[PDB]
């Protein structure tokens, strides 16, 4: 796909200039973070009453009572599949979003591993709130919303694999 | 300004590979060239039977019978304003294009100046066929067809204050 390679290189946006610093909220309930922002948590040194967590990393973590967490290991390299872990992640982030359950996604850095789920979560609610919305529209809206979450974290889906399989998925798929 | 940005971001391609070394058809009778091709045909050793030359240099020129020359001085810099003669060059390449006269559009190098026309002719053209075309339909478009044209000839459209005066007035509005 020509479109799908295209946007890949627009969303191409080198280095870093500055590292995710706090937590970021995507939507009323769902946040990104990195094991920073997890660790807070599961210290009960959080300012949110989190109720899920989505732990993205390849270590696994016991919980506090009243914490969720869902375990989605991956690792943070170029061939690593996503393609059939998003479209389930998508939708659980979607149902604790209306269950109106405060949900923290969160991998080491939390640039990529998660990055890629409020990726492809924005994605997704944006295409709920628009399912008309044509390729064209959702090539510029995806590019739009990389750089405003890049914006505010500096470092955000940077794993080029990650973000293609994204484009293809919510992109180039109707 | 805000949404032009980013497209700006897509056509940022890096240095050129290669240079243009001989004229590109853009169109059934538009062509993009550079002052070695309009050399050529005011020799008369071109290969097409230009009766247009659209001259975008500071430089004026005499032509042949036969042959008109409009001149629209501009000069390739990070202080010209391509747009507000854009409008208005489009407007005589269509004309120009519907009484099927084979014209040739020029700057020195046939990379910014001219690349800009070019740009500028094959998005009205575009706009004028399929006048419902989408923002992010013109978006693509633009994107498409700069990587397509900077394919043919190496340097096109570098001049990043020309490009994203492009993207304002053809994708923008």
């Given at each position: 796909e020509w479109y799908a390679r295209l946007l890949l290189r627009c969303t191409?946006?080198?280095?870093?200039l500055a590292l995710p610093s706090g937590m970021t909220r995507?939507?009323?309930?769902v946040y990104l973070g990195s094991a920073e922002d997890a660790r807070a948590v599961l210290r009960g040194d959080s300012g949110v009453d989190f109720k899920c967590l989505v732990n993205m990393t390849m270590s696994k973590y016991s919980t506090p009572a009243g914490i969720t967490a869902y375990h989605i290991p991956l690792r943070d390299?170029?061939?690593?599949?996503i393609a059939s872990i998003m479209p389930a992640l998508v939708k659980l982030l979607a149902r604790l979003e209306a269950e109106q359950k405060p949900t923290l996604v969160h991998s080491?850095?939390?640039?990529?591993r998660s990055g890629a789920a409020a990726m492809g979560y924005v994605m997704h609610k944006r295409l709920a709130e628009n399912?008309?919305?044509t390729q064209p529209a959702r090539f510029v809206y995806f590019l739009k919303t990389y750089y405003e979450i890049r914006d505010l974290?500096?470092?955000?889906?940077?794993?080029a694999n990650f973000r293609y399989q994204l484009i293809k998925m919510f992109v180039c798929d109707s």
């Open positions: 191409r946006a080198g280095p870093p995507l939507t009323d309930h390299d170029d061939k690593t599949n080491v850095a939390g640039v990529n399912p008309t919305m974290r500096g470092a955000f889906l940077e794993n």
